[PDB]
Design a protein around this nucleic acid. Sequence first.
RNA 1: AGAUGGUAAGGGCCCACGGUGGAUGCCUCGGCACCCGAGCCGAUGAAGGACGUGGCUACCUGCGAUAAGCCAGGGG
RNA 2: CGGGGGGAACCUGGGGAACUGAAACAUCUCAGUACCCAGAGGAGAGGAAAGAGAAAUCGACUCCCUGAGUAGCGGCGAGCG
RNA 3: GCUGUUGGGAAGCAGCGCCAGAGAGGGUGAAAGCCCCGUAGGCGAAAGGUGGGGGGAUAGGUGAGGGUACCCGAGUACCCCGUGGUUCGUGGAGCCAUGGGGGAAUCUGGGCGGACCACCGCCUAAGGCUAAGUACUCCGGGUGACCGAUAGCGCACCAGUACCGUGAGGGAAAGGUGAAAAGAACCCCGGGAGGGGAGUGAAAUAGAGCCUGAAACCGUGGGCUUACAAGCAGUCACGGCCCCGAGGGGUUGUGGCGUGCCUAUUGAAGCAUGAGCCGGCGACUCACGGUCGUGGGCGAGCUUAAGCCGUUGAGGCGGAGGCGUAGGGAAACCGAGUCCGAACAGGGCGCAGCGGCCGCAAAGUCCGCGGCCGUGGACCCGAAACCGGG
RNA 4: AGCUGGGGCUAGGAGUGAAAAGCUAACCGAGCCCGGAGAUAGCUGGUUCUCCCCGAAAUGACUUUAGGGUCAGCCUCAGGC
RNA 5: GGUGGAGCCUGGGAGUGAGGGCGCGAGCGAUAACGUCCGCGUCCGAGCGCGGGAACAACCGAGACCGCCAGCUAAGGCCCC
RNA 6: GGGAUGACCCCAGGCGGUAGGGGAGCGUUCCCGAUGCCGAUGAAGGCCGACCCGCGAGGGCGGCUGGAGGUAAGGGAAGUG
RNA 7: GACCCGGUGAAAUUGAACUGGCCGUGAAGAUGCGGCCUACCCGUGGCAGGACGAAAAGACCCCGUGGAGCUUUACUGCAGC
Lengths: 107, 100, 149, 64
Amino acid sequence: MRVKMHVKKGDTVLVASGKYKGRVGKVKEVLPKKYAVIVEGVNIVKKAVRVSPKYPQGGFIEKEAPLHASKVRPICPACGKPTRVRKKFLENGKKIRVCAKCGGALD
Amino acid sequence: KGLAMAVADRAREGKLLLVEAFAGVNGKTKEFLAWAKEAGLDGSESVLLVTGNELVRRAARNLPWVVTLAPEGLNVYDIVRTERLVMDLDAWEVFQNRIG
Amino acid sequence: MKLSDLRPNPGANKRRKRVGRGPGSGHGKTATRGHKGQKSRSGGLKDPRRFEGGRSTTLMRLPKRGMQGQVPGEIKRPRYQGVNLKDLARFEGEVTPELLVRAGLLKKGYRLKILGEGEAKPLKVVAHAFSKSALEKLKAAGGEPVLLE
Amino acid sequence: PKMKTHKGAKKRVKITASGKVVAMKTGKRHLNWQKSGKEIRQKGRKFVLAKPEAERIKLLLPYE
RNA sequence: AGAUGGUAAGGGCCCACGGUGGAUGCCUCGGCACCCGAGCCGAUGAAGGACGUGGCUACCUGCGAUAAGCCAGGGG
RNA sequence: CGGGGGGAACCUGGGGAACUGAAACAUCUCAGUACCCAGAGGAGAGGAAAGAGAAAUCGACUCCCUGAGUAGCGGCGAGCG
RNA sequence: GCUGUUGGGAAGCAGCGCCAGAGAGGGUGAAAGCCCCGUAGGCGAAAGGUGGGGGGAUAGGUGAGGGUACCCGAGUACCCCGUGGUUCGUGGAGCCAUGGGGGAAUCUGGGCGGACCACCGCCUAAGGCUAAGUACUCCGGGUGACCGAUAGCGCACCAGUACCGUGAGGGAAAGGUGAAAAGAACCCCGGGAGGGGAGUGAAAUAGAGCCUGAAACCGUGGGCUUACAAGCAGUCACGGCCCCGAGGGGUUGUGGCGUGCCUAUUGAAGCAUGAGCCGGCGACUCACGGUCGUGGGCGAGCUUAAGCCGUUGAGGCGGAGGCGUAGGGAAACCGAGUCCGAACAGGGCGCAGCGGCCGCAAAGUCCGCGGCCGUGGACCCGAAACCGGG
RNA sequence: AGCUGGGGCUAGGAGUGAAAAGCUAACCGAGCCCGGAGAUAGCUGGUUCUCCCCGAAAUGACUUUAGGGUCAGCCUCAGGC
RNA sequence: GGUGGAGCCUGGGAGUGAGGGCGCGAGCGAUAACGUCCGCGUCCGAGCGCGGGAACAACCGAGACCGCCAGCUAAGGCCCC
RNA sequence: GGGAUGACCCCAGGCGGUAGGGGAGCGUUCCCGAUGCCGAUGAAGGCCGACCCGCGAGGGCGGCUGGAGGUAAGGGAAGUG
RNA sequence: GACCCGGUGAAAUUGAACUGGCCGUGAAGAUGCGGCCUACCCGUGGCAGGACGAAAAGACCCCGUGGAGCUUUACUGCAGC
Ligand SMILES: NC(=[NH2+])NCCC[C@H](N)C(=O)O
Ligand SMILES: [Mg+2]
Ligand SMILES: [Mg+2]
Ligand SMILES: [Mg+2]
Ligand SMILES: [Mg+2]
Ligand SMILES: [Mg+2]
Ligand SMILES: [Mg+2]
Ligand SMILES: [Mg+2]
Ligand SMILES: [Mg+2]
Ligand SMILES: [Mg+2]
Ligand SMILES: [Mg+2]
Ligand SMILES: [Mg+2]
Ligand SMILES: [Mg+2]
Ligand SMILES: [Mg+2]
Ligand SMILES: [Mg+2]
Ligand SMILES: [Mg+2]
Ligand SMILES: [Mg+2]
Ligand SMILES: [Mg+2]
Ligand SMILES: [Mg+2]
Ligand SMILES: [Mg+2]
Ligand SMILES: [Mg+2]
Ligand SMILES: [Mg+2]
Ligand SMILES: [Mg+2]
Ligand SMILES: [Mg+2]
Ligand SMILES: [Mg+2]
Ligand SMILES: [Mg+2]
Ligand SMILES: [Mg+2]
Ligand SMILES: [Mg+2]
Ligand SMILES: [Mg+2]
Ligand SMILES: [Mg+2]
Ligand SMILES: [Mg+2]
Ligand SMILES: [Mg+2]
Ligand SMILES: [Mg+2]
Ligand SMILES: [Mg+2]
Ligand SMILES: [Mg+2]
Ligand SMILES: [Mg+2]
Ligand SMILES: [Mg+2]
Ligand SMILES: [Mg+2]
Ligand SMILES: [Mg+2]
Ligand SMILES: [Mg+2]
Ligand SMILES: [Mg+2]
Ligand SMILES: [Mg+2]
Ligand SMILES: [Mg+2]
Ligand SMILES: [Mg+2]
Ligand SMILES: [Mg+2]
Ligand SMILES: [Mg+2]
Ligand SMILES: [Mg+2]
Ligand SMILES: [Mg+2]
Ligand SMILES: [Mg+2]
Ligand SMILES: [Mg+2]
Ligand SMILES: [Mg+2]
Ligand SMILES: [Mg+2]
Ligand SMILES: [Mg+2]
Ligand SMILES: [Mg+2]
Ligand SMILES: [Mg+2]
Ligand SMILES: [Mg+2]
Ligand SMILES: [Mg+2]
Ligand SMILES: [Mg+2]
Ligand SMILES: [Mg+2]
Ligand SMILES: [Mg+2]
Ligand SMILES: [Mg+2]
Ligand SMILES: [Mg+2]
Ligand SMILES: [Mg+2]
Ligand SMILES: [Mg+2]
Ligand SMILES: [Mg+2]
Ligand SMILES: [Mg+2]
Ligand SMILES: [Mg+2]
Ligand SMILES: [Mg+2]
Ligand SMILES: [Mg+2]
Ligand SMILES: [Mg+2]
Ligand SMILES: [Mg+2]
Ligand SMILES: [Mg+2]
Ligand SMILES: [Mg+2]
Ligand SMILES: [Mg+2]
Ligand SMILES: [Mg+2]
Ligand SMILES: [Mg+2]
Ligand SMILES: [Mg+2]
Ligand SMILES: [Mg+2]
Ligand SMILES: [Mg+2]
Ligand SMILES: [Mg+2]
Ligand SMILES: [Mg+2]
Ligand SMILES: [Mg+2]
Ligand SMILES: [Mg+2]
Ligand SMILES: [Mg+2]
Ligand SMILES: [Mg+2]
Ligand SMILES: [Mg+2]
Ligand SMILES: [Mg+2]
Ligand SMILES: [Mg+2]
Ligand SMILES: [Mg+2]
Ligand SMILES: [Mg+2]
Ligand SMILES: [Mg+2]
Ligand SMILES: [Mg+2]
Ligand SMILES: [Mg+2]
Ligand SMILES: [Mg+2]
Ligand SMILES: [Mg+2]
Ligand SMILES: [Mg+2]
Ligand SMILES: [Mg+2]
Ligand SMILES: [Mg+2]
Ligand SMILES: [Mg+2]
Ligand SMILES: [Mg+2]
Ligand SMILES: [Mg+2]
Ligand SMILES: [Mg+2]
Ligand SMILES: [Mg+2]
Ligand SMILES: [Mg+2]
Ligand SMILES: [Mg+2]
Ligand SMILES: [Mg+2]
Ligand SMILES: [Mg+2]
Ligand SMILES: [Mg+2]
Ligand SMILES: [Mg+2]
Ligand SMILES: [Mg+2]
Ligand SMILES: [Mg+2]
Ligand SMILES: [Mg+2]
Ligand SMILES: [Mg+2]
Ligand SMILES: [Mg+2]
Ligand SMILES: [Mg+2]
Ligand SMILES: [Mg+2]
Ligand SMILES: [Mg+2]
Ligand SMILES: [Mg+2]
Ligand SMILES: [Mg+2]
Ligand SMILES: [Mg+2]
Ligand SMILES: [Mg+2]
Ligand SMILES: [Mg+2]
Ligand SMILES: [Mg+2]
Ligand SMILES: [Mg+2]
Ligand SMILES: [Mg+2]
Ligand SMILES: [Mg+2]
Ligand SMILES: [Mg+2]
Ligand SMILES: [Mg+2]
Ligand SMILES: [Mg+2]
Ligand SMILES: [Mg+2]
Ligand SMILES: [Mg+2]
Ligand SMILES: [Mg+2]
Ligand SMILES: [Mg+2]
Ligand SMILES: [Mg+2]
Ligand SMILES: [Mg+2]
Ligand SMILES: [Mg+2]
Ligand SMILES: [Mg+2]
Ligand SMILES: [Mg+2]
Ligand SMILES: [Mg+2]
Ligand SMILES: [Mg+2]
Ligand SMILES: [Mg+2]
Ligand SMILES: [Mg+2]
Ligand SMILES: [Mg+2]
Ligand SMILES: [Mg+2]
Ligand SMILES: [Mg+2]
Ligand SMILES: [Mg+2]
Ligand SMILES: [Mg+2]
Ligand SMILES: [Mg+2]
Ligand SMILES: [Mg+2]
Ligand SMILES: [Mg+2]
Ligand SMILES: [Mg+2]
Ligand SMILES: [Mg+2]
Ligand SMILES: [Mg+2]
Ligand SMILES: [Mg+2]
Ligand SMILES: [Mg+2]
Ligand SMILES: [Mg+2]
Ligand SMILES: [Mg+2]
Ligand SMILES: [Mg+2]
Ligand SMILES: [Mg+2]
Ligand SMILES: [Mg+2]
Ligand SMILES: [Mg+2]
Ligand SMILES: [Mg+2]
Ligand SMILES: [Mg+2]
Ligand SMILES: [Mg+2]
Ligand SMILES: [Mg+2]
Ligand SMILES: [Mg+2]
Ligand SMILES: [Mg+2]
Ligand SMILES: [Mg+2]
Ligand SMILES: [Mg+2]
Ligand SMILES: [Mg+2]
Ligand SMILES: [Mg+2]
Ligand SMILES: [Mg+2]
Ligand SMILES: [Mg+2]
Ligand SMILES: [Mg+2]
Ligand SMILES: [Mg+2]
Ligand SMILES: [Mg+2]
Ligand SMILES: [Mg+2]
Ligand SMILES: [Mg+2]
Ligand SMILES: [Mg+2]
Ligand SMILES: [Mg+2]
Ligand SMILES: [Mg+2]
Ligand SMILES: [Mg+2]
Ligand SMILES: [Mg+2]
Ligand SMILES: [Mg+2]
Ligand SMILES: [Mg+2]
Ligand SMILES: [Mg+2]
Ligand SMILES: [Mg+2]
Ligand SMILES: [Mg+2]
Ligand SMILES: [Mg+2]
Ligand SMILES: [Mg+2]
Ligand SMILES: [Mg+2]
Ligand SMILES: [Mg+2]
Ligand SMILES: [Mg+2]
Ligand SMILES: [Mg+2]
Ligand SMILES: [Mg+2]
Ligand SMILES: [Mg+2]
Ligand SMILES: [Mg+2]
Ligand SMILES: [Mg+2]
Ligand SMILES: [Mg+2]
Ligand SMILES: [Mg+2]
Ligand SMILES: [Mg+2]
Ligand SMILES: [Mg+2]
Ligand SMILES: [Mg+2]
Ligand SMILES: [Mg+2]
Ligand SMILES: [Mg+2]
Ligand SMILES: [Mg+2]
Ligand SMILES: [Mg+2]
Ligand SMILES: [Mg+2]
Ligand SMILES: [Mg+2]
Ligand SMILES: [Mg+2]
Ligand SMILES: [Mg+2]
Ligand SMILES: [Mg+2]
Ligand SMILES: [Mg+2]
Ligand SMILES: [Mg+2]
Ligand SMILES: [Mg+2]
Ligand SMILES: [Mg+2]
Ligand SMILES: [Mg+2]
Ligand SMILES: [Mg+2]
Ligand SMILES: [Mg+2]
Ligand SMILES: [Mg+2]
Ligand SMILES: [Mg+2]
Ligand SMILES: [Mg+2]
Ligand SMILES: [Mg+2]
Ligand SMILES: [Mg+2]
Ligand SMILES: [Mg+2]
Ligand SMILES: [Mg+2]
Ligand SMILES: [Mg+2]
Ligand SMILES: [Mg+2]
Ligand SMILES: [Mg+2]
Ligand SMILES: [Mg+2]
Ligand SMILES: [Mg+2]
Ligand SMILES: [Mg+2]
Ligand SMILES: [Mg+2]
Ligand SMILES: [Mg+2]
Ligand SMILES: [Mg+2]
Ligand SMILES: [Mg+2]
Ligand SMILES: [Mg+2]
Ligand SMILES: [Mg+2]
Ligand SMILES: [Mg+2]
Ligand SMILES: [Mg+2]
Ligand SMILES: [Mg+2]
Ligand SMILES: [Mg+2]
Ligand SMILES: [Mg+2]
Ligand SMILES: [Mg+2]
Ligand SMILES: [Mg+2]
Ligand SMILES: [Mg+2]
Ligand SMILES: [Mg+2]
Ligand SMILES: [Mg+2]
Ligand SMILES: [Mg+2]
Ligand SMILES: [Mg+2]
Ligand SMILES: [Mg+2]
Ligand SMILES: [Mg+2]
Ligand SMILES: [Mg+2]
Ligand SMILES: [Mg+2]
Ligand SMILES: [Mg+2]
Ligand SMILES: [Zn+2]
């Protein structure tokens, strides 16, 4: 039915793996289909573009590329530490994301 | 007969061990290694745990080196599969009453 | 013992005869089957147990004997299975058709008839028929024959 | 499917207790007036069939 | 007096690299076999279709002039 | 109020071959199978003894095992069962 | 579950830890119990559907002796004639069914127990209904000592499609870049296609006509060799040149020898058959029964089948039954004997472990394995033809 | 007794046939498709790795049998004498 | 006497049942046929592997496990090839 | 014959071969072995090899390609050349 | 048209080819065996003597206990009368 994302645009995430592993930033977009994500300044790549009215003078343009979701990990704003996402049943009785390192919330 | 030859082999090796009960296990794997540790079951040897006590079978069944079975299902292949063999005197008892 | 240790005894799992796989096997080409002929052909020969090549068969040429039966068919008359004395040594006391069945001596549905090839034992025996020889041995050996109805 | 007992045999022949094939004697069905008394007499008896032919007539009797 | 080499129009064998071609190896949404589950639809117009349908739309899907869709309840 | 038509096979009823096997072939077999038709349903058929058949007994029907390739059937041939 | 490390990428190797009623599996830049989807274990439905289990209703259910002799399923039972079904092919031919003819009875009735008669017994036709246990698999799910793009369904891809046929009907071929398009801006030769640098990437003979890229087939360069030779083309010896560092590799001038492969044949190089070449598909199996052999288990005893329980790649139960323990005879029937026979005659088919109670061996039987046989397409491909419905 | 467009009817042991067994969708002594179906084929062909030991027959008898088969003969293997 | 891939017995698996040349004994044929039909034997078949025979399955020689740039022989050969 | 048993050693003899019988092995797909071992310091596959062991079918070693799989001793089952 | 030049570019066939003649031989009609003669390597336009040339698993002939059509005082059945 739905693609399960433990991360959503645009909370703060830890590039767990990959070439930019360890780096941190916001999630600039979420791609469920490919189950990937774009992160600010991460997976940067140089891409070519025609001498086009949008891109006069030709040249290349740094694009931010997507990453597989299993590579990204959220950062609890409380303990500031990357954590696995549990899910808490409030008395709303809504369900909310909460850090597993500490009971903090993540939105 | 092959169900008695199987055991006996492990008996010749002394790899066979029985126990009255399992002291303090109640459905948590870690409640078992502490036991198995004190029984000389270090994990260096694959083991066939053969008892009726469910909780016990549930504690160690996830364990990479333990084969669980209700003694009502003790079979040669699983015996030979293993390096040791453990039983309740219960599981021991019904065993007797099947090769008899 | 150990799985790698488990061999079968030598000779109890023989290979197979693959025919048609090369000159080396000595079974290639004609597949141990000959050259031409109805026998090499697929399907092959009529039942060699009987057919003989056209001539009247050995069995069809033999005469038929006795009653072959008729419809509705078999007639039901009580049937007797005989057991020899020596086969009765193992028991003590009182023999009946039942026990001799559960022992594995007399089949069900048949009646019990004692034979004499052996030696009687001073035993109470119950049956549906004895032999002249069997009786003499049975009454002489201090036994108690007991016919049934 | 299981094998079917050939009745053409079970009506003519009979397997002994040792594994032999015994069929009645051929010749005295008819045309017997000028035959001997020895020839009628002897032909009224069974005869053990030749080993090869009997072996065949037993594979037809798989259940006797 | 005599005797013996170098030519290669092209051919042949051998090594090197490529062209063509798509075997082989790994892969797999798909297919096969068994066990279980489940089992009718239809004049309240079925099964299956035609023609249409998007702002731009060849085909496929989805839908029916309310036409990738309208209402309501539940889930997320 | 109901019917009509569709459904991959499965089911019951009305009809129903042949090659082939019999080392030819006609009775026989292949087989009431393949196929056609009507019908039904999630199942259909069968089903509460005017039965079986020798136990002085069994107790509707259906299906599987077994009885059994037994009893019997058959140009007593092939084969059927 | 972090770190450190090589690396394009860690899930790899090292150190220190942890969970486990979860170490099934699949993903993530490679090989992750603890990163993502999941797994064990638990939760869950306002509305439609189902509801064979639970509770409640309702239609429906029920006594005994005595006398009465009204009823008890009609062109039916019953007889004959013609058929069909049953194992029954007219057979001694009953039973069930019925196209034709004749044509009753109501318990003191009638059908049945294999023609018929009697005795004894079983049943109670000519109206109907009836769950489950049973069969199939368009559908959904789980699982495989099932296939892995000539395989597996005819289709892994826009397939019952393109194309063939008037029509029923026939019926394909065709998958893969990369971790990520970051899919090659810009410049250069060219009309373009295509390429040459630049640039991306770990890799560009991974450049989209893309993973690996074999073989036939084609071509460029190089070494040896060939224009007086002859031949199934190769083999042996020698010699010359080239390469590699008392030896080896490639090549071939001369001398010797030499009638392809397969097939079918008394016999082929054979002017007998098949094959242009290469790559892939391509033919002795399976189930039941039988018969020898064999490794084991038990052994006058061996063994269960469908099923019931258990398991979720756990096994155990189940003795109905089958083979064996006795054979001979057409059979009654006798039985270690029996049959032909008057026979105590003669003949046919039959009849009887090893050491010191023990152990060991065995008739037999059971599962495995193997060869062969019977039944089915039964080693693979191939007819001309028969038949049925369209 | 002509030729011809268009609308129609007649079909598989059946149709048409100024008759040839011609025609019936480019081969008609019984059309085509699909099915029974993997019909049958005692005929021809084809049957895929290696090494090791032995090693035939093309005879006789019967055979609607003669280019196929049953038994014996000659080969082979295991056990026994 | 003979200890041989000799023989007897029981049992499993086959293939063969289209032979051909030579020599001797015959028939048939013409005291023909690379003719045909039997008998004893031999060889090819299966030794189309080797030597001789100019070349050639069956005439002479001789039964090939493999390797040698060692020796002796059989048929047949020794002027040259 | 050793020695005791397939330990390897010595002596002697056998070993042409179609149909065909028999025996011992190689190799391909798959399963247990395997929650294991091999693998990015490079799997399977592919091109070379004049080297190693094997009678041979085949098995290792090395170099280039290749870029994520492979799978031992010992056994089991086949769509096995 | 054929033949030369530029442009496009098939076919059946094809064991592999390094493919001469004569007298002999051989499964009896040899480019491929034996002896001898001849012959420098590759081509183009031509002619058809041989590769028992190509094509179609001989229409003829026989074989098969193959088929099918036609026939009758062959056998046995059916419609029909
Ligand atoms: N408790 C038991 N009986 N366990 C038996 C094994 C079950 C299952 N196959 C497992 O490995 O988890
Ligand atoms: Mg870091
Ligand atoms: Mg988690
Ligand atoms: Mg293990
Ligand atoms: Mg475990
Ligand atoms: Mg096997
Ligand atoms: Mg088998
Ligand atoms: Mg052979
Ligand atoms: Mg063999
Ligand atoms: Mg053959
Ligand atoms: Mg054979
Ligand atoms: Mg055979
Ligand atoms: Mg052949
Ligand atoms: Mg033949
Ligand atoms: Mg033959
Ligand atoms: Mg066939
Ligand atoms: Mg046949
Ligand atoms: Mg009888
Ligand atoms: Mg008898
Ligand atoms: Mg007689
Ligand atoms: Mg008489
Ligand atoms: Mg008489
Ligand atoms: Mg006389
Ligand atoms: Mg007289
Ligand atoms: Mg008499
Ligand atoms: Mg029986
Ligand atoms: Mg018996
Ligand atoms: Mg040159
Ligand atoms: Mg040149
Ligand atoms: Mg040359
Ligand atoms: Mg290349
Ligand atoms: Mg390509
Ligand atoms: Mg694989
Ligand atoms: Mg998939
Ligand atoms: Mg599909
Ligand atoms: Mg089925
Ligand atoms: Mg449905
Ligand atoms: Mg809404
Ligand atoms: Mg809504
Ligand atoms: Mg809501
Ligand atoms: Mg809502
Ligand atoms: Mg309907
Ligand atoms: Mg019917
Ligand atoms: Mg009809
Ligand atoms: Mg017929
Ligand atoms: Mg058939
Ligand atoms: Mg038959
Ligand atoms: Mg048949
Ligand atoms: Mg027939
Ligand atoms: Mg026949
Ligand atoms: Mg016929
Ligand atoms: Mg029938
Ligand atoms: Mg029907
Ligand atoms: Mg209808
Ligand atoms: Mg219907
Ligand atoms: Mg049901
Ligand atoms: Mg019903
Ligand atoms: Mg009633
Ligand atoms: Mg029985
Ligand atoms: Mg039976
Ligand atoms: Mg008869
Ligand atoms: Mg029948
Ligand atoms: Mg780094
Ligand atoms: Mg790390
Ligand atoms: Mg795992
Ligand atoms: Mg699990
Ligand atoms: Mg995984
Ligand atoms: Mg792995
Ligand atoms: Mg993982
Ligand atoms: Mg669960
Ligand atoms: Mg619930
Ligand atoms: Mg009442
Ligand atoms: Mg009353
Ligand atoms: Mg009355
Ligand atoms: Mg009938
Ligand atoms: Mg009659
Ligand atoms: Mg009848
Ligand atoms: Mg009856
Ligand atoms: Mg009537
Ligand atoms: Mg009465
Ligand atoms: Mg009456
Ligand atoms: Mg009646
Ligand atoms: Mg009657
Ligand atoms: Mg009656
Ligand atoms: Mg009755
Ligand atoms: Mg009666
Ligand atoms: Mg009466
Ligand atoms: Mg009755
Ligand atoms: Mg009634
Ligand atoms: Mg009914
Ligand atoms: Mg029902
Ligand atoms: Mg039911
Ligand atoms: Mg499914
Ligand atoms: Mg796979
Ligand atoms: Mg596979
Ligand atoms: Mg493909
Ligand atoms: Mg395909
Ligand atoms: Mg592929
Ligand atoms: Mg057509
Ligand atoms: Mg069309
Ligand atoms: Mg067609
Ligand atoms: Mg397509
Ligand atoms: Mg990719
Ligand atoms: Mg440009
Ligand atoms: Mg330009
Ligand atoms: Mg330009
Ligand atoms: Mg370009
Ligand atoms: Mg370029
Ligand atoms: Mg770069
Ligand atoms: Mg690298
Ligand atoms: Mg590389
Ligand atoms: Mg490359
Ligand atoms: Mg590449
Ligand atoms: Mg890949
Ligand atoms: Mg490529
Ligand atoms: Mg390429
Ligand atoms: Mg060159
Ligand atoms: Mg000269
Ligand atoms: Mg020269
Ligand atoms: Mg020399
Ligand atoms: Mg040196
Ligand atoms: Mg010479
Ligand atoms: Mg030479
Ligand atoms: Mg020679
Ligand atoms: Mg020759
Ligand atoms: Mg030929
Ligand atoms: Mg010939
Ligand atoms: Mg030649
Ligand atoms: Mg030639
Ligand atoms: Mg031929
Ligand atoms: Mg050929
Ligand atoms: Mg071709
Ligand atoms: Mg090929
Ligand atoms: Mg085959
Ligand atoms: Mg076989
Ligand atoms: Mg099969
Ligand atoms: Mg089988
Ligand atoms: Mg067997
Ligand atoms: Mg046992
Ligand atoms: Mg038992
Ligand atoms: Mg006697
Ligand atoms: Mg005697
Ligand atoms: Mg024993
Ligand atoms: Mg057995
Ligand atoms: Mg056999
Ligand atoms: Mg079949
Ligand atoms: Mg077959
Ligand atoms: Mg075919
Ligand atoms: Mg066919
Ligand atoms: Mg006909
Ligand atoms: Mg006809
Ligand atoms: Mg007109
Ligand atoms: Mg007209
Ligand atoms: Mg018209
Ligand atoms: Mg018509
Ligand atoms: Mg017709
Ligand atoms: Mg028709
Ligand atoms: Mg029709
Ligand atoms: Mg007509
Ligand atoms: Mg047509
Ligand atoms: Mg035509
Ligand atoms: Mg016809
Ligand atoms: Mg036509
Ligand atoms: Mg059809
Ligand atoms: Mg059929
Ligand atoms: Mg036929
Ligand atoms: Mg090969
Ligand atoms: Mg002969
Ligand atoms: Mg005979
Ligand atoms: Mg005759
Ligand atoms: Mg002849
Ligand atoms: Mg024979
Ligand atoms: Mg022997
Ligand atoms: Mg000897
Ligand atoms: Mg010999
Ligand atoms: Mg011999
Ligand atoms: Mg033999
Ligand atoms: Mg013959
Ligand atoms: Mg001949
Ligand atoms: Mg022949
Ligand atoms: Mg002959
Ligand atoms: Mg002869
Ligand atoms: Mg001759
Ligand atoms: Mg000659
Ligand atoms: Mg001669
Ligand atoms: Mg002389
Ligand atoms: Mg002479
Ligand atoms: Mg002579
Ligand atoms: Mg003579
Ligand atoms: Mg002569
Ligand atoms: Mg001749
Ligand atoms: Mg002859
Ligand atoms: Mg031959
Ligand atoms: Mg010779
Ligand atoms: Mg010889
Ligand atoms: Mg010779
Ligand atoms: Mg040769
Ligand atoms: Mg040759
Ligand atoms: Mg020679
Ligand atoms: Mg010579
Ligand atoms: Mg010479
Ligand atoms: Mg010799
Ligand atoms: Mg000398
Ligand atoms: Mg000379
Ligand atoms: Mg000369
Ligand atoms: Mg040899
Ligand atoms: Mg020798
Ligand atoms: Mg020899
Ligand atoms: Mg052979
Ligand atoms: Mg052997
Ligand atoms: Mg073998
Ligand atoms: Mg192997
Ligand atoms: Mg292989
Ligand atoms: Mg595993
Ligand atoms: Mg693995
Ligand atoms: Mg790397
Ligand atoms: Mg590398
Ligand atoms: Mg593989
Ligand atoms: Mg491998
Ligand atoms: Mg490699
Ligand atoms: Mg993987
Ligand atoms: Mg493996
Ligand atoms: Mg192994
Ligand atoms: Mg195993
Ligand atoms: Mg295959
Ligand atoms: Mg195959
Ligand atoms: Mg010019
Ligand atoms: Mg030109
Ligand atoms: Mg040729
Ligand atoms: Mg020349
Ligand atoms: Mg001549
Ligand atoms: Mg000549
Ligand atoms: Mg010449
Ligand atoms: Mg020449
Ligand atoms: Mg030559
Ligand atoms: Mg020559
Ligand atoms: Mg020319
Ligand atoms: Mg010419
Ligand atoms: Mg010419
Ligand atoms: Mg010309
Ligand atoms: Mg010519
Ligand atoms: Mg020529
Ligand atoms: Mg010509
Ligand atoms: Mg032609
Ligand atoms: Mg022709
Ligand atoms: Mg032909
Ligand atoms: Mg032909
Ligand atoms: Mg021909
Ligand atoms: Mg012909
Ligand atoms: Mg004919
Ligand atoms: Mg005939
Ligand atoms: Mg014939
Ligand atoms: Mg005819
Ligand atoms: Mg009429
Ligand atoms: Mg009339
Ligand atoms: Zn936190």
